[PDB]
Design a protein around this ligand. Structure first.
Ligand SMILES: *[C@@H]1O[C@H](CO)[C@@H](O[C@@H]2O[C@H](CO)[C@@H](O)[C@H](O)[C@H]2NC(C)=O)[C@H](O)[C@H]1NC(C)=O
Ligand SMILES: *[C@@H]1O[C@H](CO)[C@@H](O[C@@H]2O[C@H](CO)[C@@H](O)[C@H](O)[C@H]2NC(C)=O)[C@H](O)[C@H]1NC(C)=O
Ligand SMILES: *[C@@H]1O[C@H](CO)[C@@H](O[C@@H]2O[C@H](CO)[C@@H](O)[C@H](O)[C@H]2NC(C)=O)[C@H](O)[C@H]1NC(C)=O
Ligand SMILES: *[C@@H]1O[C@H](CO)[C@@H](O)[C@H](O)[C@H]1NC(C)=O
Ligand SMILES: *[C@@H]1O[C@H](CO)[C@@H](O)[C@H](O)[C@H]1NC(C)=O
Ligand SMILES: *[C@@H]1O[C@H](CO)[C@@H](O)[C@H](O)[C@H]1NC(C)=O
Lengths: 575, 575, 575
């Protein structure tokens, strides 16, 4: 009797199930949580009277049905076209070559093209019924507004490591984009994979017309073979096809033999999104959407969320060779590198060493064990990055009467990795060693620990040997090519992202390259901080350019614009 | 019981779903938000008693059904005819060659004509049921009126950078035009693509009559082949066709085998817009639509919105070669240039350099790093534009008792780009480098940063080398052709629109040209300003020519016409 | 009238049976108990109005139907793809090669590939109807919250052995993961096993197209043979197939002859989970989910549960040879080792001996019997690990009047195992001796007890002799290869996990290898402790870095933030 069911009891007609305002992960092409609030307290319908819609949603009747007679030809996976989220992937961004490269649809097409040198053809029927958009005047959802205020509280109390962590949880829960418009409808798609040698034989206009005719035979005729696309060209066509599937998106489920008439009757009340557009997530963090906060404080929240989205694109970028016919083809690479024609020069190094340094003298945990490692061939330790490894421990003291008390300290320790035998190559915790596919070293190799969770397999051992190309990081390059990329003929691979620092290495294995595609490193990219910083309660927020000031009322009820008498009355206890 | 549902419960008949008064993007041909207010508080219907309409909408019964026997022939994509928004694209404007050039329908026709040298034919059935118009006496919507008052407030407080930003958000949300009349109906269209060599063979009257006959075979007969357009001419016709599709726009969804009788029965209650006319968005910003504002103040708001629409057309204009048979054909060019017959002269330059200058001496951010770059071949830095790069930072001081306070400053910095090796060529953030299609430099090339987010790949490296043609901007041309265009044989490409300043460059690659079509740079074209200006509260608005004056009542309730006693009583505290 | 049935009586429509928020065992791929709370006190439905859902669950309408024409080919069991829990097995973890390796589906595929050198093909129809996710703002279930507070109470009272035991009961009841999203739908799968020699014969595209055609003959046609996939290729295909099954997952039960039309009608109200994603179990133990506990205390609970999950993966990891064509293939090994090419060197040892040491002088139990064993060939006892064997006993004293009293002591005893004849080899309690498959020694062999429940069969006896490779443990390696792995040509086998210490041994039998697959060692891996430690009641919890403190109110009602007056008032009785 309140909200959705009040409309449904009064009107007796369904609710439109394709709605914008939700979050969107633009790498995986999945829907990620509700950013905007959608309330039903006006009983609004679409103007044809078919669907209940939210009060702040307007629809545009398209009623458009497209029917193709020819299949398209998609030449390569690098220029990927989604067919269900095409508008939001190809937006103007500095990340356009990574969008949609971790979706289930893309992983299947990249596998099938590389595995048996195939090109993909697509023919489809497409029904666009409504375009569904948000109004510009629109409020945030309560769950999304609450998680933005928590990032604001951690930035006031100078808890930057905690605020960066909560921003990466926001990207995990709400994605990178917010959909502002969705195309509601249904589609029926056939996707074939043909040998690339069959293409280059005048050719293309006769192939694609037969693929579109075979598609209409598959839908209209039953599984008993009564087709009409059987001629001389099809006997070669059926033998060069390496894979074939039919998918329905919306409507009734497809089976071979449903007519195109009957599939188009079941589209009603089964609409899904077949296209969508949107804006980045930090666009909707501005003083208009968050009115009960100071001005420059929400631009600091929006800058934190924007940095978290940009890390999510950078940690999932794989530069490398992309040209399939060339040697040193990198199958895990989603971005080209220019290293297709690469001359390889072998060069070795002695070993890799570490040292450990404790800022706090600890008699409890003894962090120096299993953190420092010396060279096997030099004997002692003889820079990549510079970071601090903290750990919390517990004291527990009593006094007999028995009551007790426990204090929690933070044991700090600091390590330094360095480079300047037999390989290998390496494996971290979260990765495996593709020399063994086993998170272990081969026979005759002992692991060298170079980080907190990374092992390097180093020693008859020449049967497993792979070359080497250097290390680099997000701040330090390598001189082997102060530049980030590998030398030519080498492929780069991530190894133990630590505190938001991507450190990589270069090899010439060929077995680190092949295998399954990497499944999309998700935030958070840092362990939760140990809360090593005290809450510094800010009371006055101001900026010098506007001479505007914000003072919140005790005890932390609401922010409020200031008055120059109330400023210096509060600046006396502040300064 | 209030508004729409009060009419529907009383009358028991649907609402007309094709309504004017909404916003319209004339580049992409999409509907963009509601500009006019449409209320239903009279229960008005169309005069045939079929549809509920708004109170300020009048309809004209057309009841017109057009049935073509011959296909048209559309000769080229430059003279594009939309078939669903033809009247509003071809209006009298200074932008007529860019209208509709980013719509989904145009992108498909330009691709299919260029890819296999095709000409497009179109045959259609078209039902115009109503012409639906707005009355001249009409009010603005509440959401659109609210966003115009926010532009008025930023212009009163001398916040010009914020008012320009809010005007570009108005174009993003509400488009460039407002539809004043829409043609409600349904259409059934077949679009073929034939080889251009098949056209020039007496010919045209026999081709188009067979295409119109094949269209009526496709609709009337089932997918089982029982057609009557099978003769000697069709066997050549079926072999020169490169693509074919059938689309329905409104009505029931099309399938091959629905009769033309049956398709025309399902048009009722499924009407869509098949044509529309309209006026520019700034036409509706005038003292009659906004009565509760001063006179010259709304002409300042209308001039701001008009400038924002004109930037949206200018940033999406691509001059270049258009003649398909000529060399140096620019596939990304939507506007002709006159550089079809172009003689190429090679000429090099040494390098490109920058200097940085801080207006504020900052001991916190140190903007000089990663902003200045020197020449690799000269050693030191030895003009395109002149703009200021600002950045906000945060101080945080405490006093132990612990309360705190944080001030936000604006760190200003100013850079200068300059021109007067091996290429290349370049890539910005939001663009990629089409030498690699990868947002990266080729092998042997290191990036030269020339802007805040732009890289220029400059060094065996002659295998990737492309020529060079110069730089120019919206204020500074180049002498290589003080003129804006490229020299002959070169194509221009945008690179890092910065603060509303289009700066471009010229190349002779051939790989920067090809690829997918650019997807329509959308507003805002500037980052949000850092609010570096104080609110100057204007109280009296007047003009010298009329001697009329407007004084708003404290505290900022409403504007009001003035009296000469109340002027000098308020001019005493003003001057 | 309260909860679930209140919704069902009002709405008269079923409840969605595929819900996230439950626990998940990622080794066995089974559902393990309810972690999150799901309440129905809003009568929420899916937006198509088909299913009642919980109030903190949102669904995404997918309505997606995939229909494959070609079977896949899965090359080996090491790269296992689950087809029903594929997303949660292949997550980014340091355990990725053990996930799903104890599920019923994997045990069948690994058996059928090894037994008759087979490769597996899979073809499937797959209907994804909804994606069902949890909101980020979500509370824990009452049963799961109660078992986390019990781990908190044992850590306050310094009862670490009891808290480690209750953490392993949490993994047994609630699994290792929590599902955050489930794909609701139905699938119809055919899985064949073909001879691997039939694969390598152009070949793969004709095999998989016939397997997909035979699948559609099996579903559509009745058991009376009327198939259409009968040609020259199938007569070889039917003879190289070693096993074949059809499974339905969701929907109506499959029988040969149900049409694909009829199977897709019965999917409604019979949805199951066909994919799922999730996060580790210790991710949901944080101060936001448990608000009524101190800060650093729940990070100690989360570290205890994380250690228990990591033991569950480590005790079920079997390194060894994996290459099927090589000798010394280890059938029980689920993780590769690099010991495929291994040269075997025979070397013997004299014997194994033990000594016992009692820390408490006991005149009641006499633990020295059946705990110490000497060498048969040396005569006396002449280190693996160092652990204490405790035992509780009972006194019972009376005084005639007759009332009584019984005290429970803890008899401590400590044993030491050592190494430095004829085999063998050994058997523990929970294992058997695969030389006899009988938990007994062969003829001519007497058992040598090396642990509390382990026997070693050591002596005409050369007919049962197997070689030897050494012992090692989780802290002590062996020098025969201070390294953990076996020497080459040897396989490792677990033997009597004792107090969380995996101690293993190496053999070259070939009969310890073969047999059935090991059925997934489940927690707890330790007997319950004898409660040998007094409750040390902590009252004040604090940490030095934040200077925050928590004081619970007498008598142990609730925790509460502290005040500096109440600290030293409570630190007086504490110190
Ligand atoms: C893959 O396609 C090629 C064509 O590019 C096929 O080769 C032709 O097959 C037809 C079939 O009878 C022959 O008549 C031609 O002589 C073949 N050669 C050429 C150059 O056209 C090839 O057969 C296809 N692959 C398979 C496995 O059939
Ligand atoms: C494309 O169109 C041309 C005509 O412009 C076709 O060429 C003719 O095809 C017919 C078909 O039998 C022949 O009888 C003529 O002799 C051809 N030449 C001329 C000059 O008319 C051409 O065949 C078409 N393309 C394809 C692939 O069929
Ligand atoms: C297993 O597969 C092999 C093919 O790899 C079969 O061998 C062929 O069988 C056909 C059947 O008539 C013969 O015509 C061929 O001459 C055989 N050899 C080759 C090299 O193709 C084998 O028969 C299959 N196993 C069984 C038991 O039938
Ligand atoms: C804020 O945190 C930073 C973190 O390093 C620290 O350096 C700084 O001193 C802190 N400032 C205050 C006022 O607490
Ligand atoms: C806590 O338990 C450990 C277990 O060995 C013991 O060593 C320690 O003395 C105990 N501390 C207190 C305060 O009871
Ligand atoms: C308990 O029973 C045992 C049984 O043999 C006996 O030896 C012992 O004396 C009894 N103790 C008491 C206190 O009754």
């Amino acid at each position: 009797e309140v909200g959705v069911q009040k409309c449904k009891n009064a009107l007796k007609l369904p609710v439109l199930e394709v709605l914008p305002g939700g979050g969107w992960d633009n790498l995986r092409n999945v829907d990620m949580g509700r950013v905007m609030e959608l309330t039903y307290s006006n009983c609004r319908t679409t103007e044809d009277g078919q669907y209940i819609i939210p009060d702040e949603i307007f629809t545009i009747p398209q009623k458009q049905s497209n029917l193709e007679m020819n299949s398209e030809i998609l030449e390569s996976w690098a220029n990927y076209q989604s067919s269900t989220s095409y508008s939001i992937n190809t937006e103007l961004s500095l990340f356009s070559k990574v969008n949609g490269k971790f979706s289930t649809e893309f992983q299947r097409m990249k596998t099938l093209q590389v595995k048996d040198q195939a090109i993909t053809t697509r023919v489809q029927v497409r029904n666009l019924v409504y375009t569904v958009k948000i109004n510009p005047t629109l409020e945030l959802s309560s769950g999304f507004r609450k998680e933005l205020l928590d990032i604001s509280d951690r930035l006031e109390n100078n808890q930057t490591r905690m605020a960066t962590y909560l921003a990466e949880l926001l990207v995990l829960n709400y994605g990178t984009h917010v959909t502002t418009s969705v195309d509601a409808g249904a589609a029926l798609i056939q996707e074939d994979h043909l040998r690339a040698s069959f293409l280059q034989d005048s050719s293309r206009s006769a192939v694609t017309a037969s693929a579109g005719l075979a598609f209409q035979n598959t839908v209209n005729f039953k599984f008993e073979e009564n087709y009409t696309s059987q001629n001389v060209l099809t006997k070669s066509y059926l033998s060069n096809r390496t894979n074939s599937r039919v998918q329905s998106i919306g409507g009734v489920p497809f089976y071979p033999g449903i007519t195109l008439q009957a599939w188009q009757q079941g589209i009603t009340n089964h609409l899904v999104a077949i296209d969508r557009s949107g804006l980045p997530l930090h666009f909707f963090i501005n003083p208009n959407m968050l009115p009960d906060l100071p001005g420059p404080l929400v631009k600091k929240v929006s800058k934190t969320v924007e940095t978290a989205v940009k890390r999510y694109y950078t940690f999932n970028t794989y530069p490398g060779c992309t040209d399939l016919n060339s040697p040193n083809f990198n199958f895990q690479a989603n971005t080209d590198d220019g290293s297709c024609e690469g001359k390889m020069t072998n060069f070795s190094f002695g070993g890799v060493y570490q040292e450990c340094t404790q800022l706090s003298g600890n008699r409890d945990v003894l962090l120096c064990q299993k953190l420092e490692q010396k060279n096997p061939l030099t004997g002692d330790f003889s820079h990549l990055l510079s970071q601090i490894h903290e750990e919390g421990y517990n004291h527990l003291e009593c006094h007999r009467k028995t009551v007790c008390e426990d204090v929690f300290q933070v044991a700090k320790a600091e390590f330094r990795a360095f480079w300047c035998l037999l390989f290998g190559g390496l494996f971290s915790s979260k990765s495996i060693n593709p020399m063994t596919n086993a998170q272990s070293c081969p026979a005759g190799y002992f692991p060298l620990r170079l980080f907190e969770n990374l092992k390097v397999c180093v020693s008859l051992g020449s049967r497993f040997a792979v070359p080497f190309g250097g290390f680099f990081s997000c701040t330090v390059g390598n001189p082997l090519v102060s530049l980030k990329k590998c030398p030519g003929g080498f492929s780069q691979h991530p190894a133990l992202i630590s505190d938001g620092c991507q450190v990589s290495y270069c090899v010439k294995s060929g077995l680190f390259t092949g295998g399954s595609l990497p499944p999309a490193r998700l935030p958070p990219f840092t362990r939760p901080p140990l809360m090593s910083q005290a809450a510094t309660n800010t009371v006055i927020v101001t900026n010098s350019e506007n001479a505007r000031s914000w003072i919140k009322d005790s005890q932390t009820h609401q922010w409020r614009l200031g008055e120059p008498i109330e400023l210096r009355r509060a600046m006396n206890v502040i300064h």
